[PDB]
């Protein structure tokens, strides 16, 4: 498994930012706001403790302009042909990938506008292709993604 | 203010059933959006609305103009309305507990011709089918029977939905007219109805134009309205657009000065004056959409090659063989958009198959058009079209159309280019400018029409295709002697602006 790239289509400081990814990522720069918003975007995608609070008014590009937030992550689901990690990596989800020879897995985030009821309504969808993404099935409060990724956040 | 303004103001503050007899397209959905925006803002209760269109693409266009809401509005096709509000929640109540609640509804395989045999498809093999006849609807009649039988379906559809907004009622069979009249008779739900009576009905085979036209002759509980859609913005162009020769001249009222019509040219220096309204008078805006309508397509290239030397980089789009009026023009144009754009999404073409609500059957038609990806001009074009034709019915609407369909992709490129992207500086001839409206226009008075002094439709589309501004320029003597006749007989001398 290997992270490939992340696309933040809208956030509180990002407009059309596309970042390539890998394992063991190191992010630096002068803009501390951009780094902490990148980490908050990662937490919003992969942690339920921040997902359960929803989006506010201040977490947009402008506070009323372009109320449409998408955060997409690529996964590189396939492995080597001599390694049997491919089926064990695939077998967490069943109906998301139509083809057994699919290569790249997508995990996406969707946001609703903030004029009515003042709330964000975080929606998560995954799939092996950009179009016709399916919703992540959650039977209770815990969805299917939280059984896969356990996020540990360290900050002294 | 004549037929444009009073039709809008009498349709916003109304509160009863509405039957609008709109024109032949060109913005009937503007008033559908503007009424919904007025109705949703006026009503402050928990009741929501429902907007019904035929194609799924027009449902996204209505949703795009509206925005988004959390009121529980239903925007979509009529097939999605019946399958999700009446059948799927209430199938297990009205027709027995043993009937299943989840199913896939394919309209590509089943061709049964019995109602009682129809329930055997749903009960046994979990498939919701369709009738044999085009003049039938198994889905809409099942929604009528469930609503008539069970009680809690009736407790739903009155208490959530305020008014159902209906569009293209003219090509509607008997079954959908029975359900939509049932919601008005007993359950007391208001309706909004738009469409054009008769005048070459197409779409959703099985039409029955006594459902719509019979609701204008003898019906009484319907506020009937005339041609109401405002194709042209403002008033000053409309007075020019209502001239022709006579008849509508009594509907024209004129003022002391004009605003949107400028006539300054005599010796046409095309590059010089057309620059001068941009900077020296601030009339023309380059960033806005500039459309220029001329005839004789070789002369448009001569204009194009002149401005390519200057730098305007003008674009011409010609008359395709498919631009002739045919019932299959809407989806045949979209098919070549799938293959010639080389990246175009299949679900945009999937958003045009009449009633839509197609899941997993898009991949069946994806493989058929993927066989058309090979060039293979001679002998693959006939069969793979007929294979694509036979899947979605509407069969033998061909011969003349398929010969023109071979002509547009003859040698794979009839002129290499097609309307696949978005660009400005477009030229349209009269053969292919019908239907879509234009923001800016510099057509310089639409010459070469004094020879006939007849054929009033030809200068009608030259005048009415603009939105708010339009430029008429004194160029020709015979045009001037023709328009000097229209000075005196209009009873008002003002056509020109001067201090």
Curated annotation (Swiss-Prot), chain A:
Site (Interaction with GajB): 94, 97
Knockout consequences: When this gene is missing the Gabija type I system does not confer resistance to SpBeta in B.subtilis.
Residues noted as binding ATP in the record, renumbered to the chain: 32-36
Its job: Component of antiviral defense system Gabija type I, composed of GajA and GajB. Has no detected ATPase activity. Expression of Gabija type I in B.subtilis (strain BEST7003) confers resistance to phages phi105, phi29, rho14, SpBeta and SBSphiC. Expression of Gabija type I in E.coli B (strain ATCC 11303) confers resistance to phage T7.
Domain-level remarks: The N-terminal ATPase-like domain seems to have lost ATPase activity, but may still bind nucleotides. The C-terminal Toprim (topoisomerase/primase) domain probably has the endonuclease activity, but when expressed alone (residues 348-578) has not activity, showing it requires the N-terminal ATPase-like domain for function.
Subunit comment: Homotetramer. Forms the core of the anti-phage defense complex. Interacts with GajB; 2 GajB dimers dock at opposite sides of the GajA complex to form a 4:4 GajA-GajB assembly (GajAB). GajAB interacts with Bacillus phage Phi3T Gad1 protein; this interaction forms a 4:4:8 GajAB-Gad1 complex and leads to GajAB inhibition.
Protein name listed in UniProt: Endonuclease GajA
Protein source organism: Bacillus cereus (strain VD045)
Lineage: Bacteria, Bacillati, Bacillota, Bacilli, Bacillales
Gene this protein is translated from: gajA
Residues of the full protein shown: 1 to 156 of 578
Curated annotation (Swiss-Prot), chain B:
Family membership noted in the UniProt record: Belongs to the helicase family.
Signal peptide (UniProt feature, chain positions): none
CDD domains referenced in this protein's UniProt entry, alphabetically: DEXQc_UvrD (cd17932)
Residue ranges occupied by any UvrD-like helicase ATP-binding domain in the UniProt entry: 6-234
One of the GO BP terms on file: recombinational repair
Keywords noted in UniProt: Antiviral defense, ATP-binding, Helicase, Host-virus interaction, Hydrolase, Nucleotide-binding
Disruption phenotype: When this gene is missing the Gabija type I system does not confer resistance to SpBeta in B.subtilis. When this gene is missing the Gabija type I system does not confer resistance to T7 in E.coli.
Identification of the protein by name: Gabija protein GajB
Chain residues that bind ATP: 22-29
Function: Component of antiviral defense system Gabija type I, composed of GajA and GajB. Expression of Gabija type I in B.subtilis (strain BEST7003) confers resistance to phages phi105, phi29, rho14, SpBeta and SBSphiC. Expression of Gabija type I in E.coli B (strain ATCC 11303) confers resistance to phage T7. May be a helicase or contribute to GajA activation.
Free-text comment about domains: Contains a UvrD-like helicase domain.
InterPro entries listed in its UniProt record: DNA_helicase_UvrD/REP, P-loop_NTPase, UvrD-like_ATP-bd, UvrD-like_helicase_C
Species annotation: Bacillus cereus (strain VD045)
Superkingdom of origin: Bacteria
């Amino acid at each position: 498994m290997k992270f490939s790239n992340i696309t933040i289509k809208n956030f509180r400081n990002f407009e059309k930012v596309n970042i390539n990814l890998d394992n063991k990522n190191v992010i630096f720069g002068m803009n501390d706001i951009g780094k902490t918003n990148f980490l908050y975007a990662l937490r919003f995608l992969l942690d339920k403790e921040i997902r359960k609070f929803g989006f506010n008014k201040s977490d947009y590009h402008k506070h009323d302009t372009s109320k449409k937030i998408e955060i997409i992550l690529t996964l590189d689901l396939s492995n080597y042909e001599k390694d049997e990690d491919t089926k064990k990596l695939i077998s967490v989800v069943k109906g998301a990938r139509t083809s057994a020879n699919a290569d790249v897995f997508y995990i996406a985030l969707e946001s609703k506008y903030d004029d009515k009821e003042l709330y964000g309504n975080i929606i998560l969808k995954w799939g092996s292709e950009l179009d016709n993404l399916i919703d992540i099935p959650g039977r209770g409060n815990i969805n299917a993604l939280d059984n896969v990724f356990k996020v540990i956040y360290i900050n002294p | 203010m004549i037929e444009d303004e009073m039709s809008r103001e009498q349709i916003i503050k109304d509160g009863g059933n509405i039957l609008v007899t709109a024109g032949a397209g060109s913005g009937k959905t503007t008033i559908l959006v503007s009424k919904i925006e007025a109705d949703l803002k006026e009503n402050k209760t928990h009741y929501s609305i429902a907007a019904v269109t035929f194609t799924n693409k027009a449902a996204k266009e209505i949703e795009g103009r509206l925005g988004y809401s959390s009121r529980g509005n239903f925007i979509g096709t009529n097939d999605g309305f019946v399958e999700s509000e009446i059948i799927r929640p209430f199938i297990k109540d009205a027709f027995g507990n043993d009937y299943p609640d989840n199913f896939t509804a394919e309209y590509f395989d089943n061709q049964f011709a019995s109602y009682d045999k129809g329930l055997q498809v749903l009960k046994y093999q979990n498939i919701l089918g369709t009738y044999s006849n085009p003049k039938k609807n198994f889905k809409f009649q099942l929604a009528l029977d469930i609503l008539k039988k069970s009680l809690v379906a009736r407790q739903y559809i009155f208490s959530k939905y305020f008014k159902i907004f209906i569009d293209e009622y003219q090509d509607s069979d008997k079954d959908m007219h029975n359900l939509f009249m049932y919601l008005k008779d007993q359950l007391k739900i208001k309706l909004f109805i738009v469409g054009d009576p008769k005048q070459s009905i197409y779409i959703w085979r099985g039409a029955e134009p006594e459902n719509f036209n019979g609701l204008i002759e003898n019906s009484t509980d319907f506020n009937k309205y005339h041609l109401t859609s405002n194709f042209r913005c403002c008033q000053d162009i409309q007075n020019y657009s209502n001239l022709f020769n006579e008849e509508t001249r009594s509907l024209i009222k004129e003022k002391n000065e004009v605003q949107n019509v400028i006539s300054i040219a005599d010796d046409m220096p095309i590059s010089d004056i057309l620059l001068k309204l941009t900077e020296e008078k601030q009339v023309l805006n380059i960033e806005a959409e500039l459309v220029i309508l001329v005839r004789r397509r070789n002369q448009a290239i001569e204009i194009m090659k002149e401005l390519n030397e200057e730098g305007f980089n003008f674009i011409f789009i010609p008359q395709t063989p498919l631009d002739r009026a045919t019932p299959n023009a809407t989806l045949l144009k979209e098919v070549i958009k799938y293959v010639k754009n080389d990246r175009y999404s299949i679900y945009d073409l999937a958003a045009e198959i009449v009633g839509n609500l197609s899941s997993r059957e898009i991949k069946e038609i994806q493989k058929i058009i993927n066989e058309l990806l090979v060039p293979n001009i001679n002998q693959v074009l006939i069969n793979q079209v007929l294979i694509n034709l036979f899947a979605k019915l509407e069969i033998t609407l061909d011969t003349r159309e398929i010969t023109a369909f071979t002509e547009v992709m003859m040698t794979n490129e009839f002129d290499i280019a097609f309307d696949t992207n978005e660009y400005l500086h477009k030229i349209f001839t009269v053969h292919s400018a019908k239907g879509l409206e234009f923001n800016q226009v510099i057509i310089t008075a639409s010459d070469y029409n004094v020879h006939y002094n007849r054929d009033t439709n030809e200068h009608y589309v030259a005048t009415t295709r603009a939105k708010d501004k339009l430029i008429v320029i004194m160029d020709n003597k015979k045009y001037s002697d023709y328009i000097e006749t229209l000075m005196k007989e209009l009873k008002i001398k003002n056509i020109i602006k001067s201090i």
